[PDB]
Amino acid sequence: AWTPLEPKLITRLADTVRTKGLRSPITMAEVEALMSSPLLPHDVTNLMRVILGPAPYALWMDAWGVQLQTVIAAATRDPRHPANGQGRGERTNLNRLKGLADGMVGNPQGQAALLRPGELVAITASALQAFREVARLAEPAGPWADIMQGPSESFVDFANRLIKAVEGSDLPPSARAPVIIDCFRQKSQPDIQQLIRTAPSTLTTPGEIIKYVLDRQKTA
Amino acid sequence: AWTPLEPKLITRLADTVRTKGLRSPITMAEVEALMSSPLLPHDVTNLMRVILGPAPYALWMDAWGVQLQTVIAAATRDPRHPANGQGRGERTNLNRLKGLADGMVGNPQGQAALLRPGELVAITASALQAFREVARLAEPAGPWADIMQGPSESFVDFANRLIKAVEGSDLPPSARAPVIIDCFRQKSQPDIQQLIRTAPSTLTTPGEIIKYVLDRQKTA
Amino acid sequence: AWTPLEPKLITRLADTVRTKGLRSPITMAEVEALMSSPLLPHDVTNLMRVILGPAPYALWMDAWGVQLQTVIAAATRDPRHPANGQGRGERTNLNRLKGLADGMVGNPQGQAALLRPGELVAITASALQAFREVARLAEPAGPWADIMQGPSESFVDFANRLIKAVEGSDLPPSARAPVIIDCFRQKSQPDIQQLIRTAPSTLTTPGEIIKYVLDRQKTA
Amino acid sequence: AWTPLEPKLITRLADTVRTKGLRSPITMAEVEALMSSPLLPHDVTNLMRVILGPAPYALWMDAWGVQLQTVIAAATRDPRHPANGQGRGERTNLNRLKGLADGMVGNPQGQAALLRPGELVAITASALQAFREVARLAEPAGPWADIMQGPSESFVDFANRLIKAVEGSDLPPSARAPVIIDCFRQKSQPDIQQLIRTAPSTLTTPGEIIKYVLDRQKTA
Amino acid sequence: AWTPLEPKLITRLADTVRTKGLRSPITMAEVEALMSSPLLPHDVTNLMRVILGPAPYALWMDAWGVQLQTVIAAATRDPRHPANGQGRGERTNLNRLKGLADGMVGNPQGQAALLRPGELVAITASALQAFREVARLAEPAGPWADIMQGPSESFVDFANRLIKAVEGSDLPPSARAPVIIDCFRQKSQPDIQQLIRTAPSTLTTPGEIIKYVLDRQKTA
Amino acid sequence: AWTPLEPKLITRLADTVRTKGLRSPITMAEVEALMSSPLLPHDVTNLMRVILGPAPYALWMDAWGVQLQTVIAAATRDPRHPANGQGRGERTNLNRLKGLADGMVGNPQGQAALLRPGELVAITASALQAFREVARLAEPAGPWADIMQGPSESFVDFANRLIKAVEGSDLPPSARAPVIIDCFRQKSQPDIQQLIRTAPSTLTTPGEIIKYVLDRQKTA
């Protein structure tokens, strides 16, 4: 059974993209809303082709190959992975997921009949990762470290901007909390620094420091 | 029998939360009518990621963690809590809820394949109250004990402003009515003072005070 | 099986009550259509909380109290009351309406499996009439007997102003038509008075007088 | 059982009326679409109040009284009329239809319980008649006889204009076909006259002459 | 068990027929998908009045009358026609269909209370073909035997224009294909002539001729 | 119980095919979603008549002929064919597909109660692939090997033009990637050629080359 899409969502998506571009929050928001449920290679290909021009679509496909092979390596790391099902004649492979699987080419009905959903979930997540990667590459803007809380910007939206910027750069996972917190301390508006340095030095994640500064933040 | 959310609903929710605001009611009403059915961790996580930016999402992870800690303490300290099933040998921990042990990690299919309705509704409730706290922390409520009814205003919009503000306090759940009424009597203009005092003092609820002072107010 | 209210309904209702204003019949007909089917205390109360400001919300709560008070007093006074409970321990009571008694709070399923349909219809009736009362007392109808036809406003716009004024006041049914007639024959400009008092027949209904002036209307 | 309306229809109606006015074709079109099915006095009153300003609403009510009493006289003319049902304790009366019937005031549920539909159909038809009457009176334009097929207007739309104009004037039923046809012959563009005078003089209705001139009409 | 039409459908139909046009397909497709269920005279009459102006409505009454005459002749001359029921004593006449005898006059309720499905579907079919004829008569179809493929055009839009036009003729239902093909071969530009002639003459259907001449045409 | 197609679906589809143009993937995904469930000959044929011009309609009819011809020939050649009929007189045939045989014309109910679901799936498959073929042959894809990078167009827009060109031609799957690569290394402007031929690694996929130029892209 295949559960396709509806032209309402796709059309509103195309219109929002055409009027804003992939650097929009609402763009990626509608994309994430459309791509939460388990999907199929056919639908995700067609959707990305709806929202992306030709050459960025090719770049999308390259990124998708990279992420998909990462997930393939993960599947190799363990049989009990959801990508390596309890039938051994179903070992996952770079061709299996990508969609050119046997008896399914250009015929998503077979992709609905003989695929296993957890694979599709991994596909979807890797797809969104690659899509943010394409948003980065095709449309760059400012690097992360060089961001400052403006002479008038409210703090929490500055925090949103900064976290979204940092996590979407070449840094690895482990370097996503303390780097952000130190950027807070040594770049944000001075009063907020004096606020932060007072914090008990046993606090870890950025969100905890955000909660910290939110209480003590004034109402102007 | 698992089922995700038809992206129409998450889409509309994201639209209204990006537009209107987080403290106004319709936000909460939609969220509740959405977050009532038995859910799962992966169900609410990506939902929060979609309807919230990065930094309030970090706050949300924080508050959800605290509430899950409360639920786990309550469940383990009382095996009579719904968070457990037919057997005591299957206690419920934080990992079982935060999606950390096997049969669960990044496996929405497995998360459908495992937990019992008790833990499900528990997690949903935790998420809901977490969202309320993220609302209150994430945006200011005016200085309630300061607003002074301005001349060119009507008493009614002043009263609505004041109830809105006073609700946004640490104040206990019940003891709002006396605070509100006394702020009415002692916080208004000259004329409203002298038209509330001289009443037959059987008016001891806010709505009635509004009824009075408006019913005897200028019509032009 | 308690079916709640579709959030889209409530949200569009809020948009209407917002822009289109309370005292416009769009709102009246819509709210009637939303509270037409059988309805339940918790749902409709939270509804009115959603679609209104908090102070008019408390105003509505008080009006609902008074209306349901007449209803429960009528149920007391009459055995064959429209919404009585013939069971030998199944009579009605006020706290079995406002959602207060055992198993009413938080669990509308109890509000369904404890209450009788006649009770729900009484609740909905009182709620609707209460909302209308809040509408009347929430917007100050202009003073009617102060209108005097302008030196350069069209006759028909004057008529609309004055009739919308008259129908919206304390005046009982009988106090509509004749008051309108006489305000027309007197409050009007002399020229239009010169006409309508050049009586060639009995002008004994507002619409008829408007028809006369319209037939005799030189455009100005 | 009462089947109310939906805010979509009513709101689109109000918007179309506000942007065009009752002299619009689309206005009356949407009104006729909304008012085809059996209705009730409550809904028709509220709807006309939605689309009509105050004083034209009163004039609407006067016209409705006239048409309703015509239908009452018709009901008197025969018992087997659908307005005089097969229960004699249900003889129709000017108060019965108009909506101030017993046990139904401001409570359309009773109007749904104890009214008979054919009465409601007669009500609706008389309502639309009165509404066109109000469109006439409040917003007149050109008299009928003085219309000419323009130096460039296509014939069939001129025919629409002329028929709609004539039938909506003081002429009675019988004088609606030959009057129109003779206006065709002695006012329309000359070539079309020469077309018509050639027609066999045994043709009666206007539509037949319209069909006649449509064939022989050129394509330019 | 009678039921009218939910005014949403008539509303949308009126919108599209006022906007698009009467000869283009979607008009006919909607009308058919609307006019297929067993109907009644009053069902289709007001529908035609809503989705058509006055004068084409007169044409419609004309054509509906002619088609009902055909149906009545066919029914009475063959008691084996569905337009009759179990009994011969209940023949079907024009008055029984045009709503003229009792139990029917202006009585949609009675019209539900009387006729049998045969006459119903007969009336619906009559109305449908009447509408087709009103379409063909009410608007021009271009001079099909005249259009000559212009230079700056592509052969394909020319071909679509030509099939559209040729369809709008008195021409018999079947014998269109030869007319179309020969107009192709003898009505086009020089180059298209010399690229249709020199083919291997197994092309004897229109679509194939289009396939050829386009597949061998300029791409720029 | 044959459920037709909702007219609103078809009408919005026509609006899309109208404005958004055939060769845009919005249309492809939509039409797939409209012909995804089991479908029947008469309905889908009339659908394609609705959503297209008549000449491409006949083109589609011919393509449908060829596709269903391969399908019925495969059903002949294989007993265990995907859509065979195991009954001893229940084999398939071409005229039992195009809606020609007894009880197929005008009465789709026969098209349901005579045909097997495998037959319907074959019909729908052939219809969809036929529509895609009409899409290809209906819009002339620009000549690809004629592109040469402009003296002042952005690199990425050039890339989009050329890739959309390449994927849309006669070229089989294998004939996509490498042709793109080499057209990039050669057709491009000298400066971008100067870059991409200063090879510091293997550039063996279009997306990779785009990524290289993008990383090295001075904005122009």
Numbering used by the authors:
A (entry chain B), B (entry chain A), C (entry chain C), D (entry chain B), E (entry chain A), F (entry chain C): 10 to 229
Original paper wording:
As the virus buds from the cell, the viral protease cleaves Gag into several fragments, including the capsid protein (CA) that then assembles into the mature capsid shell (core), rendering the virus particle infectious. In mature lattices, CANTD interactions form only intra-hexamer and intra-pentamer interfaces, while CACTD interactions are also involved in formation of inter-hexamer and inter-pentamer interfaces.
The reconstructed tomograms of this sample showed abundant regular tubes and pleomorphic polyhedral CLPs. No ordered density for NC and also no ordered density for the β-hairpin, which has been observed in other retroviral mature CAs, were observed. Notably, an IP6 molecule could be fitted into the density in the CANTD hexamer center in an upright position, where it is coordinated by two concentric rings of positively charged residues K17 and R21.
